[PDB]
Design a binder for this molecule. Structure first.
Ligand SMILES: CC(C)CN(C[C@@H](O)[C@H](Cc1ccccc1)NC(=O)O[C@H]1CO[C@H]2OCC[C@H]21)S(=O)(=O)c1ccc(N)cc1
Lengths: 99, 99
């Protein structure tokens, strides 16, 4: 699909058996999700944004289905104000900016 | 241009007679720039992102040239770690996500 930006480019995704919505964020190097029940081991991680830093848990090789497109990559889980699909996963679906 | 996302989608822009680099950020509703003494009046504003909120100065109807494309819109000035072109200006150059 081609997505214009008059509204937030929020898409439907499937992750860890749960249904969720996430923001296609080209400004996000990596994917981050609000608190959620993922399986497996994880490592504490500290990320940064406009307002400062938050502590999150990094999970690797996580299967996501982004708007019917499957991808496997790192997914951080922590106190983000919204679920964000970062460039680490956008590249796998072949996402591009156009103008 | 069509921009892939293996690298940060950073473009060269002209603002207030100054040259700067900024991130094409579909996750940003509005444009935010590091400190710069733009001319004119402004109104205090508080925005929020990952890690909390920051206080910024809001200027309206500011001319930016994004990759040689002129646009006029709101530009926030404050302690952001990186210049971000938000959706308020991306729509004016017709920027879209494609995959
Ligand atoms: C919560 C986000 C969806 C909103 N943000 C845009 C987003 O692209 C920021 C923009 C951004 C970019 C660099 C530094 C700070 C903020 N990226 C970001 O927070 O990235 C962090 C979370 O995922 C990781 O990816 C790399 C950094 C981590 S935001 O910078 O806070 C923002 C909010 C409101 C406006 N008007 C403009 C920008």
């Amino acid at each position: 699909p081609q997505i214009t930006l008059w509204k937030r480019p929020i898409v439907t995704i499937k992750i860890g058996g749960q249904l969720k919505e996430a923001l296609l964020d080209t400004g996000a190097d990596d994917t981050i999700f609000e608190e959620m029940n993922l399986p497996g081991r994880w490592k504490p991680i500290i990320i940064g944004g406009v307002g400062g830093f938050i502590k999150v848990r990094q999970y690797d090789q996580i299967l996501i289905e982004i708007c019917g497109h499957k991808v496997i990559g790192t997914v951080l889980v922590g106190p983000t104000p919204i679920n964000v699909i970062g460039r680490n996963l956008l590249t796998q679906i072949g996402c591009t900016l156009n103008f």
